Enzyme design. Structure first.
Site, mmCIF file in Angstrom:
data_model
loop_
_atom_site.group_PDB
_atom_site.id
_atom_site.type_symbol
_atom_site.label_atom_id
_atom_site.label_comp_id
_atom_site.label_asym_id
_atom_site.label_seq_id
_atom_site.Cartn_x
_atom_site.Cartn_y
_atom_site.Cartn_z
ATOM 1 C CB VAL A 27 -6.343 5.646 -4.726
ATOM 2 C CG1 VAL A 27 -6.209 5.250 -6.176
ATOM 3 C CG2 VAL A 27 -7.114 6.939 -4.602
ATOM 4 N N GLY A 34 -3.620 5.724 14.954
ATOM 5 C CA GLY A 34 -3.689 5.155 13.624
ATOM 6 C C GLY A 34 -2.401 4.453 13.261
ATOM 7 C CG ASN A 89 -4.000 7.290 -1.833
ATOM 8 O OD1 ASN A 89 -4.732 7.245 -0.842
ATOM 9 N ND2 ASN A 89 -4.249 8.083 -2.861
ATOM 10 C CD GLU A 128 -3.232 -0.155 0.324
ATOM 11 O OE1 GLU A 128 -3.048 1.014 -0.070
ATOM 12 O OE2 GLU A 128 -4.293 -0.782 0.127
ATOM 13 C CD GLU A 174 -3.158 -0.850 -3.929
ATOM 14 O OE1 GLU A 174 -3.258 -1.436 -5.024
ATOM 15 O OE2 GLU A 174 -3.566 0.317 -3.743
ATOM 16 N N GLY A 199 0.864 -0.773 16.137
ATOM 17 C CA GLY A 199 1.260 -1.980 15.440
ATOM 18 C C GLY A 199 2.335 -1.674 14.409
HETATM 19 CA CA CA Z 1 -3.705 2.481 -2.581
#
Ligand code: CA
Lengths: 58, 223
Positions: free
Chosen positions: B57, B175, B54, B52, B62, B178
């Site tokens: 999108v 956020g 963004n 990943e 990914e 981990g």
């Molecule tokens: Ca993305």
């Protein structure tokens, strides 16, 4: 409504971005917020339904 | 990540996003079929997003793989936050190379002063709220147990290390949990907790990964 519905929201000290619901005693309605995953309070429900049941009147 | 910068796309091949519908936590791929994360990021169903950049999108690089097994540390303490580590086993091996790569476990613990890299899609504002669509990076050094313990009297176990700046301004935030703290190519920390974000004298506390290499190896090699 139990006393906990009047506790202010508390994300905690953990850095997680977890969606949960709390009863906003000011706007007088359940709302969405972000819990860190640890050490919050009882005004923290996993679904909006649960919240509306206990704190609103469901 | 507060006070950081946007990382070049796919510059952190080991960084993974945890998804249960939306992004709630981060993680690091230690081997093609296991991901390391924090215990307080536990959930019954979790999808790992690899490659990943963004998170908003579909860019095409990914890999969406579901968790087959989720194991939190036996001694995780929900109150003191001691032993905040968790292992997730992927249901299918991740296709590795270039944009998706594993991070090495520690050969030795890191000493105070060692420079590390902390990455994640967490809040960027120490005061208000702001969530980036793009991956953020931050370079921060491991603090000494002394400073850490003075920052948090009575709250630091031997399984935690403070990484950051006592002068604030830079830190990890909601956020990022981990997420990875990599120093000298080895995984040394997991974003855990902290009083607020980027606050003065309140650095970020991370799970000391070097205290669990044996446990990690055994668990993986037996699951
Ligand atoms: Ca993305």
């Amino acid at each position: 409504k139990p006393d906990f519905c009047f506790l202010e929201e508390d994300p905690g000290i953990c850095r997680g971005y977890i969606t949960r619901y709390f009863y906003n005693n000011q706007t007088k309605q359940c709302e969405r917020f972000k819990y860190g995953g640890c050490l919050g309070n009882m005004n923290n429900f996993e679904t909006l339904e649960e919240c509306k049941n206990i704190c609103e009147d469901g | 990540i507060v006070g950081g910068y946007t990382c070049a796309a796919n510059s952190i091949p080991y960084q993974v996003s945890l998804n249960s519908g939306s992004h709630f936590c981060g993680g690091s791929l230690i081997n093609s079929q296991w991901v390391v994360s924090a215990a307080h990021c536990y959930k019954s169903r979790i999808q790992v997003r690899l490659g990943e950049h963004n998170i908003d999108v579909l860019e095409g690089n990914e890999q969406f793989i579901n968790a087959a097994k989720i194991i939190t540390h036996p001694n995780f303490n929900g109150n003191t936050l001691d032993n905040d580590i968790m292992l997730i086993k992927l249901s299918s091996p991740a296709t590795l190379n270039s944009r998706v790569a594993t991070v090495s476990l520690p050969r030795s613990c890191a000493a105070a002063g060692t420079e590390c890299l902390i990455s994640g899609w967490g809040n960027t504002k120490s005061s208000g709220s702001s969530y980036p669509s793009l991956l953020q990076c931050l370079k921060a050094p491991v603090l000494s147990d002394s400073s850490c313990k003075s920052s948090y009297p009575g709250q630091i176990t031997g399984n935690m290390i403070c990484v950051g700046f006592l002068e604030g301004g830079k830190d990890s935030c909601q956020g990022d949990s981990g997420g990875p703290v990599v120093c000298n190519g080895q995984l040394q920390g997991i974003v855990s907790w902290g009083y607020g974000c980027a606050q003065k004298n309140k650095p970020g506390v991370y799970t000391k990964v070097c205290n669990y290499v044996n446990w990690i190896q055994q668990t993986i090699a037996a699951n």
